[PDB]
Design an enzyme around this catalytic site. Structure first.
Site, short mmCIF file in Angstrom:
data_model
loop_
_atom_site.label_atom_id
_atom_site.label_comp_id
_atom_site.label_asym_id
_atom_site.label_seq_id
_atom_site.Cartn_x
_atom_site.Cartn_y
_atom_site.Cartn_z
N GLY A 175 0.91 -1.19 -0.02
CA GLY A 175 -0.02 -0.04 -0.26
C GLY A 175 0.73 1.32 0.15
O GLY A 175 0.58 2.10 0.81
N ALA A 176 1.93 1.25 -1.04
CA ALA A 176 2.58 2.46 -0.81
C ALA A 176 2.60 3.68 -1.80
O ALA A 176 3.46 4.53 -2.14
CB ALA A 176 4.05 1.70 -1.08
N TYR B 228 -10.34 -0.87 14.24
CA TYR B 228 -9.15 -0.64 13.69
C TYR B 228 -8.08 -0.97 15.15
O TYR B 228 -6.88 -1.36 14.76
CB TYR B 228 -9.13 1.06 13.51
N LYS C 34 -4.66 -3.33 14.92
CA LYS C 34 -3.41 -2.95 15.09
C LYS C 34 -2.90 -3.24 16.21
O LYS C 34 -1.62 -3.60 16.52
CB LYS C 34 -3.40 -1.33 15.04
N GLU D 41 10.03 -5.14 19.23
CA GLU D 41 9.96 -3.81 19.56
C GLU D 41 8.93 -3.11 19.01
O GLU D 41 8.51 -3.36 17.72
CB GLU D 41 11.44 -3.23 19.64
#
Lengths: 235, 235, 235, 236
Positions: D13-14, D156, D160, D226
């Site tokens: 999705g760039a 959402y 995420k 991380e």
């Protein structure tokens, strides 16, 4: 009514506010509460009278929690009066808010020495006096400010964030002898409310009942944990 | 024991283990428990008779917590029986552990659908029915795997970590109506034990009583929180 | 490599280990590095010679980062010499590991004063000297032990967890003047394996290059963050 | 001028927004960037041309990051063209905000399948193609919303927060082959609310993109599992 296998609890800085409510809550749940006061005894004594007049078991005890020998001596007197000490709440603490560039190291130390070293002494001595029975639970009264920081509170956030991490280390050292160490992080306790999902300040009672849970037998598999009591202010 | 203003609770996937325990514990503190199963009523019925024989209120109910219509209609049915629903425990979930290079997309969706979408539907319908009453508490049973991840559990950790973050969003949406949403993250619940400071697996009852506290009036200022129940395994 | 708008940096306790590597990395990226040491000048001098003969800009400066007046005057000197100070790395710190029941208050304070108050002073002075130019970045070297605690390290975990919370409050106070404050939490670093996912100790250069990123322009929207550099040991 | 041992990167999705800046940033540091797009070839092909005209190496590739078979085929096409794939950025994602009581399960799934299932596929295929080289780094673009939740964003935040936990599981799986997996959680990025952000401004897409670059680069070689906050102080 929460279940407690232990019989007694020491609450530092318990004359007023959250510490006072912790005393009332734990007294009303059947524990003998030791109400620690630093200087004047009038408010502490009144709290004690209130609880005994309700038929609860209370006592007061004078010592500065920031003082190693004072705190050490007091725990010994409690073990010598009740036979042991099954629960400890490190509630004592002060604030001295300042923008950091106006903050002397003396102001930093005032809050560190009173909030963090006090809880070190308490947790250390608890480890000594509860390791024998292989039973105890210790609750450290931290703050949302120790988790997230705050303008004007570089010294308070250091003390409470250091408290939260200290407690985890104590949890490892107590774990095999079944001594639990946990922290509570109250939010705003009685516009500030605009950012609180529950749209109100928390009651001191609501902090006190979270402490009761972490001391009680119902939390017997909870150690090294931080319990947020902030109405949704921080998730 | 613990004080509950509400009267009844629905526990998804409650025939055995942690789900069964939650049902036992909550029944013993005076709540009417609805014991959910999706295929075979036997074990769930034994649970019901056991709790009723001890003097508690209990009922079984058949629906798939992963089916939107099933969940919705079951909550409507409970509201018709009882007049409403005070408490919801999203406990239903499955595992399908595989190294990710062996994991098909259908193996990812299996776990997401059974574990995360189930709890979305439950959280959504709880909001609908509890909003009328302006009272409610919802506990999402997550897992330490959702906090720290795990070899072989990319699908399960995604489902439980998603559950933790989802629950925070529901906490915002329920807050003004005093509807609370919290998560519990159990550790290892009955080599692996060596990594647990308390040096033992947790009992199912120790998870259930943490769930009990988050549903109870004693957690009335706690929403959007994740409560670790893992013996110190993760801090 | 990385881009820096600022021109210089002070690194406390920079004679050896991670702090030395930080100077090497930052010097090789074009910054004038100020190598702080407390007593022995030889190793600090040897590092300056090395960096200088490699073609970089480097100076040593003696002072005790735990001493308020020392630290204040040193930063004053650097501002006299360079016209300013754009970057600060609070790296100085000590250990004194003891089981808590063996730990004197004096032993707790030894670590608090040298690890936490030292960083408070540096952060406070950074605020003063950086605010006029409305530019700067400050990194605090904390530790995995400040995040999850450790047996035998109630004092070190207190200082580093306190450092982490502190740093966040400084991020609020610096934010409007574009003075950023972040922490790094190193895992097990060779100069300072089964449970480490990358299956090795970290190199000091790997800490140094994470610090460099947080000082760099590339992290210009990152403030009040804690960056984990632990090989996956803590997630 | 961050150092990269690897040579190419795929960014899902760039064609615009953060993903486009990731492609700009990484191409300017010497990587061949593969610009994924789903429907619109025009913006991706302008981006590709913009980068090539500045001396960089760039290519476009059409596929649905939410389709296992498409994503799989696309990565075998990249391996075929380039000899391998060193880096991957799971940036593809959508939003369908609604209060939860007004949100159908299909609106939940739409966000789950586009944001979370896609990153699973990408992470999985990264593991496969990076394994033999015993080298690699993967960045998952999550969000502050996955860390703290948000009113109207139960779908959402789930996708995420699930991405953030899932990325830690991939970190354990890739670690012995030195394949790193990390997440970024941007705050409010351009393209009132600014009052709660300490830095008193929205973040630039470039500022996310350079955080992504660091986690891909050799400079973060001891960082895996991380989550890197990029939010101007909005969440600490």
């Amino acid at each position: 009514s929460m279940q407690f296998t232990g019989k007694n609890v020491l609450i530092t800085g318990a004359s007023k506010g959250i510490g006072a409510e912790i005393a009332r809550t734990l007294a009303s749940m059947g524990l003998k509460v030791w109400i620690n006061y630093r200087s004047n005894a009038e408010v502490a004594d009144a709290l004690k009278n209130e609880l005994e007049e309700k038929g609860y078991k209370a006592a007061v005890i004078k010592f500065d929690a920031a003082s190693e020998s004072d705190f050490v001596e007091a725990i010994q007197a409690i073990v010598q009066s009740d036979g042991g000490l099954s629960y400890l709440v490190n509630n004592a603490g002060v604030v001295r808010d300042k923008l950091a560039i106006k903050m002397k190291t003396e102001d930093f130390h005032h809050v560190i020495d009173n909030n963090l070293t006090s809880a070190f002494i308490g947790c250390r001595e608890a480890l000594k006096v509860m390791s024998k029975s292989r039973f105890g639970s210790v609750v450290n009264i931290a703050s949302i400010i120790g988790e997230r920081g705050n303008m004007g509170q570089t010294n308070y956030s250091a003390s409470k964030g250091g408290m939260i991490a200290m407690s985890k280390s104590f949890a490892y050292e107590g774990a095999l002898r079944n001594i639990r160490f946990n922290s509570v992080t109250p939010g705003f306790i009685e516009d500030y409310v605009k950012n609180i999902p529950l749209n109100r300040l928390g009651a001191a009672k609501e902090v006190a009942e979270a402490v009761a849970f972490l001391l009680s037998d119902h939390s017997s598999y909870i150690t090294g944990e931080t319990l947020k009591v902030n109405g949704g202010l921080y998730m």
